[PDB]
Amino acid sequence: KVEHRLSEQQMKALTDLPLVFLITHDQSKSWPITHAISWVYAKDETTIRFAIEADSLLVKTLADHPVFTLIFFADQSTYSLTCTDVAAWETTARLPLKVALYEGQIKEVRDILFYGAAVSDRPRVYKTYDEAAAMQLDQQIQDILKG
Amino acid sequence: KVEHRLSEQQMKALTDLPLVFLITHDQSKSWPITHAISWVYAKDETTIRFAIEADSLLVKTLADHPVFTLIFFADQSTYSLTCTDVAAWETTARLPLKVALYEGQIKEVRDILFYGAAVSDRPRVYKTYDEAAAMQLDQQIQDILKG
């Protein structure tokens, strides 16, 4: 069954810089645009925030069609959530990078994993370049998202 | 950079019942439809096949808009591929389940992971019900896809 807010397990999973897949739609193409991102934060049971680089083609995409879908791992499954009323917002915090910040309200949360299976192990991601500075940057962005 | 065929690493990754995310578009909704599937097979560098249950809402979706996008893990990254000219096909093999079989031609393969990171560990999926029969079923479907 489809839910319309996040569980506690899912908020936990979406508040620790998880690997998620952001899916958006460009009127120009017949297929959706996908990005893997980790600068994501579940502010509460119905609110998702994320940060992207300000020069991203996503800025226009999200302005034109203020909807997104995230695929994420939580519990022992894979879920999708979809947000509407997606809006850019701004922080008074110092920006460490030129980023655009987004917020959306959750409309649906669906368990998308096939029948009879479960995820024993979620993906693990590491930094391949500049690890110590890159981790501190992730924390700075997280702090802005949670503000 | 965007590629237009699969590498050997990617074919390897898409020929071992991987966990992938299938993304399709329903004209009825303002957001894309997502499913996690493992019945997927890269027949060659430009050809993807998959199997879904015949009663799936995807049958109409794919007929109406013969395009799909798959997100998958390969190398130490996350990629998307998109297929056009998506068509149902039929096997002369005995069907173990009422399934619909699809084939598409790859148009683009993109590395969608964020800068400066790599996937150390891909997701692991296990059977929670009926493991021995479910694994044999996966093999039967794989055999049909590779036929």
Side-chain angles (χ1 to χ4, degrees), chain A residues 1-4 6-11 13-24 26 28 30-123 125-145 147, chain B residues 1-4 6-11 13-24 26 28 30-123 125-145 147:
Chain A
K1 52 133 68 189
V2 181
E3 299 294 348
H4 303 283
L6 294 169
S7 67
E8 296 281 353
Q9 300 277 163
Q10 293 164 332
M11 282 184 290
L14 288 165
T15 55
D16 210 3
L17 308 165
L19 176 62
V20 305
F21 299 108
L22 172 70
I23 304 167
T24 55
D26 188 325
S28 105
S30 64
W31 59 83
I33 302 184
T34 59
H35 294 84
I37 66 161
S38 66
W39 291 345
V40 76
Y41 193 80
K43 191 63 168 139
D44 60 32
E45 293 89 334
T46 64
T47 311
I48 295 295
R49 293 170 173 187
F50 68 85
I52 62 177
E53 303 212 33
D55 70 336
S56 177
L57 303 182
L58 288 190
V59 174
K60 182 49 156 28
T61 300
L62 292 165
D64 287 341
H65 189 59
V67 175
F68 67 80
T69 297
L70 300 171
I71 294 172
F72 67 100
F73 295 78
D75 303 296
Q76 283 198 138
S77 205
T78 58
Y79 299 88
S80 73
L81 63 80
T82 293
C83 291
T84 58
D85 286 341
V86 176
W89 60 278
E90 295 179 333
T91 185
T92 60
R94 187 82 59 203
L95 291 185
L97 185 145
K98 262 178 203 202
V99 295
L101 303 177
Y102 288 87
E103 188 172 281
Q105 279 302 296
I106 292 180
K107 219 209 146 279
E108 289 202 351
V109 183
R110 197 179 286 263
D111 185 344
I112 69 178
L113 190 58
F114 45 87
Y115 175 76
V119 174
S120 46
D121 301 278
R122 318 220 277 235
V125 175
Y126 72 104
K127 301 297 191 195
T128 60
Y129 185 72
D130 197 32
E131 174 180 66
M135 293 187 64
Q136 281 180 324
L137 173 62
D138 284 352
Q139 184 64 54
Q140 291 169 314
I141 296 297
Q142 172 92 327
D143 288 348
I144 285 156
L145 294 174
Chain B
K1 52 133 68 189
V2 181
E3 299 294 348
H4 303 283
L6 294 169
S7 67
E8 296 281 353
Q9 300 277 163
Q10 293 164 332
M11 282 184 290
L14 288 165
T15 55
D16 210 3
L17 308 165
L19 176 62
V20 305
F21 299 108
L22 172 70
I23 304 167
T24 55
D26 188 325
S28 105
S30 64
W31 59 83
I33 302 184
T34 59
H35 294 84
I37 66 161
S38 66
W39 291 345
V40 76
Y41 193 80
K43 191 63 168 139
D44 60 31
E45 293 89 334
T46 64
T47 311
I48 295 295
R49 293 170 173 187
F50 68 85
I52 62 177
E53 303 212 33
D55 70 336
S56 177
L57 303 182
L58 288 190
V59 174
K60 182 49 156 28
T61 300
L62 292 165
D64 287 341
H65 189 59
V67 175
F68 67 80
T69 297
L70 300 171
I71 294 172
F72 67 100
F73 295 78
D75 303 296
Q76 283 198 138
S77 205
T78 58
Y79 299 88
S80 73
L81 63 80
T82 293
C83 291
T84 58
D85 286 341
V86 176
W89 60 278
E90 295 179 333
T91 185
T92 60
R94 187 82 59 203
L95 291 185
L97 185 145
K98 262 178 203 202
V99 295
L101 303 177
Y102 288 87
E103 188 172 281
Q105 279 302 296
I106 292 180
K107 219 209 146 279
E108 289 202 351
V109 183
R110 197 179 286 263
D111 185 344
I112 69 178
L113 190 58
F114 45 87
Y115 175 76
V119 174
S120 46
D121 301 278
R122 318 220 277 235
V125 175
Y126 72 104
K127 301 297 191 195
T128 60
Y129 185 72
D130 197 32
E131 174 180 66
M135 293 187 64
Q136 281 180 324
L137 173 62
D138 284 352
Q139 184 64 54
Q140 291 169 314
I141 296 297
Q142 172 92 327
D143 288 348
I144 285 156
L145 294 174

